[PDB]
Amino acid sequence: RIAGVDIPRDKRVVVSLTYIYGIGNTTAKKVLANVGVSEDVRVRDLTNEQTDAIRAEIDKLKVEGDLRREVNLNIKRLMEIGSYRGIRHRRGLPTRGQNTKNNARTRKGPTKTV
Amino acid sequence: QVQYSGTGRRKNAVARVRLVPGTGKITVNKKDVEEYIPHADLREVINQPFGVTETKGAYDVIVNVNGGGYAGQSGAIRHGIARALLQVDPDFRSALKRAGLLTRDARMVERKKPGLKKARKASQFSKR
Amino acid sequence: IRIRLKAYEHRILDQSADKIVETAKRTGADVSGPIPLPTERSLYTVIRATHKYKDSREQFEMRTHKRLIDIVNPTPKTVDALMKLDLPSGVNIEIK
């Protein structure tokens, strides 16, 4: 559709572009402002010229594939050099200096009562 | 010219009131009451005394309010009007004292206390 | 002149303010009454125990009372008497 994702149709433009891996509300509003359209229309009521301008600015911006490659290469770099911050990833632990005693389920995954 | 003053208080709020002959308007700090109190539930609370004693279309009201929130201020205005109507006519006291409007509501805020996380609330006791 | 008195005990503060007012009326000047500014209480809470007993506590209070005096028609007599005079150490005084 735009960058490899068939976005919704009953949704409005900003909130439907939020479903791209790299675009939130702020950048969506910035893009629609740079293009000069209405932010409160629904994408099943667009002119294809507006769609094309949207696609152009999105391609100018860094999105799904490049974004995954960039973040993952960063992670792989810090894992392969052997930093603490990458050992956290390699071990499945939190990374921002949190306490790993009574919490950290979002990295530990499921609990294992032992 | 003629003025019938009162001073009402309710829940950390104060209302300096003066009744003057008029039609039934209630100014509140250079603002209308239906703009100052957006709730229609409390303008009736204010106009209770005029419902007790038939004085509704008699007096415009002028108020200087301070402290509290909208409902404490409404009760303050209620109390102040009930006071000023005695300067007007003490014969209305026989009905105001049955309404309980001279009764200054002493329902004030309770202390917070140490060991308790709030006034009468306590932390969850665990037997073990 | 404006004089700010402040203390921890109104029972002494009032006596001292009366002393000031009487010295002023003696030296022949007009003064505002000693008008009271708001007290200020600094609260303090302390664990009533020495170790690990945390729910039982004790609340101390440092209240400061404070009075304000004006002097309208300062005679040199007035300005000299109200700078010669001494007071207890509980009260404290600041002029102008």
């Binding site: - | 202390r111 | 921890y8 609260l43 303090y44 302390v46 664990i47 020495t50 004790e58 101390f60 209070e61």
Partner: protein, 60 residues
């Protein structure tokens, strides 16, 4: 270990963050009020004795 800790206090600190409060009567050192330079414990004692000006029991 104690009283060398008080020596460390009263000696000049290398850095401004290495300066830390201390009771001045007991060296607790936690629970200190800057207005008094006193632990809560000695504060309570001396307030009972009356040796702290202005303080008293509180209730409202």
């Amino acid at each position: 270990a104690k009283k060398s800790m008080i020596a460390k206090n009263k000696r000049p600190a290398k850095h401004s963050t290495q300066a830390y409060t201390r009771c001045e009567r007991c060296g607790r050192p936690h629970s200190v009020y800057r207005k008094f330079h006193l632990c809560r414990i000695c504060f309570r004692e001396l307030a009972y004795k009356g040796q702290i000006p202005g303080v008293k029991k509180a209730s409202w």
